[PDB]
């Protein structure tokens, strides 16, 4: 494998950043493979 890392930038909080997304309450299950289920998920 020829996998590598390259620095993308500093890690900072942004004042006045765009606010998006809801706040869901989800019944989920997590298996031994690290995969969540609902009662692929990996990006």
């Amino acid at each position: 494998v020829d996998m590598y890392i390259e620095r993308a930038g500093d890690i900072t909080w942004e004042k006045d950043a765009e606010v998006t997304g809801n706040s869901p309450r989800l019944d989920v299950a997590l298996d031994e493979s690290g995969d969540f289920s609902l009662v692929t998920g990996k990006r």
Binding site: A8, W13, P24, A29, L30, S33
Partner: protein, 152 residues
């Protein structure tokens, strides 16, 4: 050097982003499924995995897991999304929760394509409270990622 990193792979057509990671205190943090324990090239040479949890989908390079900040359960957080071939962007959101039969875990309803996994999620002080990119696809096709944090 501390900061957020793109996890890339060498290709004939240049490169391809397979994930994202966080460097803090000389330790590189990303998602297990991004690298699958493979060694990583870097400007300082080979980096080797030090700790891994397949179920948590986390992996640590050069040292033990260093990230420890936690979502308070009340406040808004920011995803520092580093998507493939796109510009890094801060997205603020109020997290939801994964209601596991084994406890509760915060979750952000922010949808980003494969290769963004490992992007840091921050608190108002800028500490990484978790990594993005392991979650579920909802019935409407949207993606909800857990706020995955390891044990320090």
């Amino acid at each position: 050097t501390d900061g957020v990193y793109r996890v890339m792979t060498r290709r004939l057509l240049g490169s391809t982003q397979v994930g994202v990671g966080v460097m803090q205190e000389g330790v590189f943090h990303t998602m297990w499924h991004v690298t699958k324990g493979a060694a990583l090239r870097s400007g300082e040479g080979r980096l080797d995995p030090y700790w891994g949890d397949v179920k948590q989908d986390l992996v640590s390079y050069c040292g033990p897991w260093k990230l420890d900040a936690a979502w308070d359960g009340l406040s808004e957080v920011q995803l520092l999304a580093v998507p493939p071939g796109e510009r890094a962007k801060n997205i603020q959101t109020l997290p939801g929760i994964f209601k596991t039969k084994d406890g509760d875990i915060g979750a952000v309803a922010l949808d980003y394509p494969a290769g963004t996994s490992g992007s840091p999620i921050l608190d108002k002080c800028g500490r990484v409270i978790g990594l993005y990119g392991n979650g579920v696809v909802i019935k409407n096709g949207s993606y909800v990622s857990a706020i995955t944090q390891g044990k320090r």
